[PDB]
Write an enzyme that holds these catalytic residues in place. Structure first.
Site, PDB file in Angstrom:
ATOM      1  N   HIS A 196     -17.249  -3.085   0.227  1.00  0.00           N
ATOM      2  CA  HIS A 196     -16.090  -3.997   0.208  1.00  0.00           C
ATOM      3  C   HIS A 196     -16.535  -5.392   0.595  1.00  0.00           C
ATOM      4  O   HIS A 196     -15.926  -5.998   1.486  1.00  0.00           O
ATOM      5  CB  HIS A 196     -14.970  -3.453   1.100  1.00  0.00           C
ATOM      6  CG  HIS A 196     -14.274  -2.308   0.456  1.00  0.00           C
ATOM      7  ND1 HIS A 196     -14.454  -1.007   0.879  1.00  0.00           N
ATOM      8  CD2 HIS A 196     -13.483  -2.250  -0.649  1.00  0.00           C
ATOM      9  CE1 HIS A 196     -13.751  -0.200   0.114  1.00  0.00           C
ATOM     10  NE2 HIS A 196     -13.164  -0.932  -0.850  1.00  0.00           N
TER      11      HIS A 196
ATOM     12  N   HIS B   1      -8.862 -10.054  -3.018  1.00  0.00           N
ATOM     13  CA  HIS B   1      -8.070  -8.819  -2.764  1.00  0.00           C
ATOM     14  C   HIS B   1      -8.586  -8.016  -1.573  1.00  0.00           C
ATOM     15  O   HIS B   1      -7.814  -7.144  -1.047  1.00  0.00           O
ATOM     16  CB  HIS B   1      -7.929  -7.958  -4.003  1.00  0.00           C
ATOM     17  CG  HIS B   1      -9.122  -7.118  -4.294  1.00  0.00           C
ATOM     18  ND1 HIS B   1     -10.260  -7.659  -4.799  1.00  0.00           N
ATOM     19  CD2 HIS B   1      -9.317  -5.783  -4.210  1.00  0.00           C
ATOM     20  CE1 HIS B   1     -11.164  -6.671  -4.948  1.00  0.00           C
ATOM     21  NE2 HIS B   1     -10.599  -5.496  -4.570  1.00  0.00           N
TER      22      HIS B   1
ATOM     23  N   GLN C  74     -16.551  13.433  -7.109  1.00  0.00           N
ATOM     24  CA  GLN C  74     -16.553  12.468  -8.252  1.00  0.00           C
ATOM     25  C   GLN C  74     -15.734  13.028  -9.423  1.00  0.00           C
ATOM     26  O   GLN C  74     -14.753  12.310  -9.868  1.00  0.00           O
ATOM     27  CB  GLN C  74     -17.968  11.979  -8.592  1.00  0.00           C
ATOM     28  CG  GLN C  74     -18.475  10.903  -7.582  1.00  0.00           C
ATOM     29  CD  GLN C  74     -17.586   9.668  -7.530  1.00  0.00           C
ATOM     30  OE1 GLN C  74     -17.398   8.936  -8.504  1.00  0.00           O
ATOM     31  NE2 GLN C  74     -16.944   9.434  -6.401  1.00  0.00           N
TER      32      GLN C  74
HETATM   33  C1  LIG Z   1     -13.914  10.897  -4.315  1.00  0.00           C
HETATM   34  C2  LIG Z   1     -14.808   9.639  -4.382  1.00  0.00           C
HETATM   35  N1  LIG Z   1     -13.889   8.516  -4.188  1.00  0.00           N
HETATM   36  C3  LIG Z   1     -14.095   7.319  -4.910  1.00  0.00           C
HETATM   37  N2  LIG Z   1     -15.087   7.327  -5.745  1.00  0.00           N
HETATM   38  C4  LIG Z   1     -15.362   6.216  -6.500  1.00  0.00           C
HETATM   39  N3  LIG Z   1     -16.406   6.338  -7.417  1.00  0.00           N
HETATM   40  N4  LIG Z   1     -14.703   5.021  -6.468  1.00  0.00           N
HETATM   41  C5  LIG Z   1     -13.711   4.941  -5.592  1.00  0.00           C
HETATM   42  N5  LIG Z   1     -12.887   3.933  -5.247  1.00  0.00           N
HETATM   43  C6  LIG Z   1     -11.964   4.323  -4.309  1.00  0.00           C
HETATM   44  C7  LIG Z   1     -12.219   5.570  -3.960  1.00  0.00           C
HETATM   45  C8  LIG Z   1     -11.283   6.268  -3.016  1.00  0.00           C
HETATM   46  C9  LIG Z   1     -10.709   5.660  -1.884  1.00  0.00           C
HETATM   47  C10 LIG Z   1      -9.765   6.339  -1.098  1.00  0.00           C
HETATM   48  C11 LIG Z   1      -9.320   7.608  -1.485  1.00  0.00           C
HETATM   49  C12 LIG Z   1      -9.812   8.223  -2.664  1.00  0.00           C
HETATM   50  C13 LIG Z   1      -9.208   9.582  -3.107  1.00  0.00           C
HETATM   51  F1  LIG Z   1     -10.116  10.539  -3.634  1.00  0.00           F
HETATM   52  F2  LIG Z   1      -8.396  10.138  -2.065  1.00  0.00           F
HETATM   53  F3  LIG Z   1      -8.329   9.250  -4.151  1.00  0.00           F
HETATM   54  C14 LIG Z   1     -10.758   7.530  -3.448  1.00  0.00           C
HETATM   55  C15 LIG Z   1     -13.334   6.086  -4.806  1.00  0.00           C
HETATM   56 MG   LIG Z   2      -8.888  -2.991  -0.940  1.00  0.00          MG
HETATM   57 ZN   LIG Z   3     -11.263  -3.675  -3.839  1.00  0.00          ZN
END
Ligand SMILES: CCNc1nc(N)nc2[nH]cc(-c3cccc(C(F)(F)F)c3)c12
Ligand SMILES: [Mg+2]
Ligand SMILES: [Zn+2]
EC number: 3.1.4.17
Length: 313
Positions: free
Chosen positions: A68, A106, A269
């Site tokens: 981030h 953001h 994933q």
């Molecule tokens: C599972 C692996 N996550 C992710 N994997 C990748 N490649 N990009 C991503 N960007 C945000 C998340 C993420 C953040 C918070 C919660 C969750 C949830 F799985 F609960 F939806 C997902 C995320």
């Molecule tokens: Mg954010």
């Molecule tokens: Zn973001």
């Protein structure tokens, strides 16, 4: 005003594609963003001196976290640029201005922790904002920087137009709370299929822009496999550091955040692609046909994680 930014030939071309990677040279990222603003909005939309000064303060207010960070900001802003450029006529003059800015801002002052963590730690930001904690903080930091001396890039808008653009930015940044995405996409899917979707309804445009924000935010999954694969490493490094902080509060983290459960990553994933990513680019593609390359790139990466599971890599 006669002072076009230009990029090398490989970047001039590949910057137009959805799957562009901005590269490892931090010092080009300000120029890349200004190039996108100029091609997306006009050389006229902002005062060059004021915009540079805004970009450099925005950069200063991102932190040295694995995911981030400043690179994430500019990456999310490039995906918005590619949506906007493939959807020329669909978007107002204010929307084109607000959205690239919203995307750059953001995750302002992100510390690498989820809303959940802040609430369980009892962070003061959780007292000030009961919901979408970090996103109301990101918007708050965006306004703060707009109010620094020499940093009002919106100075030539009327009081009316100014307030509309900050309201675009505000809704666009809240929409990056992934908890809000699921209901946003359900409603949009229903509107599209009962044929009630009406881009003249401000309340509809708001939802379409929220989905664009989720799409740009999640866009690591729309890159070529090598970018996607190495970005996942940054994402999980943040997740596992939070898991560690959860264990220090005496709370078993969810397995996504537990670094003892590294083995489960590829199945995780899959769920993510299946429950979040594919639905998101599918619904977006239905509303905005020219965004199909994000859906296609995502399907390609789902297929690469399925091969990771079968041990073909
Ligand atoms: C599972 C692996 N996550 C992710 N994997 C990748 N490649 N990009 C991503 N960007 C945000 C998340 C993420 C953040 C918070 C919660 C969750 C949830 F799985 F609960 F939806 C997902 C995320
Ligand atoms: Mg954010
Ligand atoms: Zn973001």
């Amino acid at each position: 005003g006669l002072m076009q930014f230009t990029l090398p030939v490989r970047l001039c071309k590949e910057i137009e594609l959805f799957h562009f990677d901005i590269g490892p040279f931090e010092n080009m990222w300000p120029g890349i963003f200004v190039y996108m603003v100029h091609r997306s909005c006009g050389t006229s939309c902002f005062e060059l001196e004021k915009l540079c000064r805004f970009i450099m303060s925005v950069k200063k207010n991102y932190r040295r976290v694995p995911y981030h960070n400043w690179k994430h900001a500019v990456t999310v802003a490039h995906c918005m640029y590619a949506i906007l450029q493939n959807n020329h006529t669909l978007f107002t003059d204010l929307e084109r201005k607000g959205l690239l800015i919203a995307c750059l801002c953001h995750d302002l002052d992100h510390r690498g922790f989820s809303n959940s963590y802040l609430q369980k730690f009892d962070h003061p930001l959780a007292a000030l904002y009961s919901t979408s904690t970090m996103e109301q903080h990101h918007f708050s930091q965006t306004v703060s920087i707009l109010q620094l001396e020499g940093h009002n890039i919106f100075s030539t808008l009327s009081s009316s137009e100014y307030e509309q653009v900050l309201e675009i930015i505000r809704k666009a940044i809240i929409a990056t709370d992934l908890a809000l995405y699921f209901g946003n996409r359900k409603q949009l899917e229903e509107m599209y299929q009962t044929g009630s979707l009406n881009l003249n309804n401000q309340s509809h445009r708001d939802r379409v822009i929220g989905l664009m924000m989720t799409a740009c935010d999640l866009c690591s999954v729309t890159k070529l496999w090598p970018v996607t694969k190495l970005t996942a490493n940054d994402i999980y490094a943040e997740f596992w550091a939070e898991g560690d902080e959860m264990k220090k509060l005496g709370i078993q983290p969810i397995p996504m955040m537990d670094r003892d459960k590294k083995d489960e990553v590829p199945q995780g994933q899959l769920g993510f692609y299946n429950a979040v990513a594919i639905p998101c680019y599918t619904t977006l593609t239905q509303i905005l046909p020219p965004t199909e390359p994000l859906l296609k790139a995502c399907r390609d990466n789902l297929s690469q994680w399925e091969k990771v599971i079968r041990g073909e890599e």
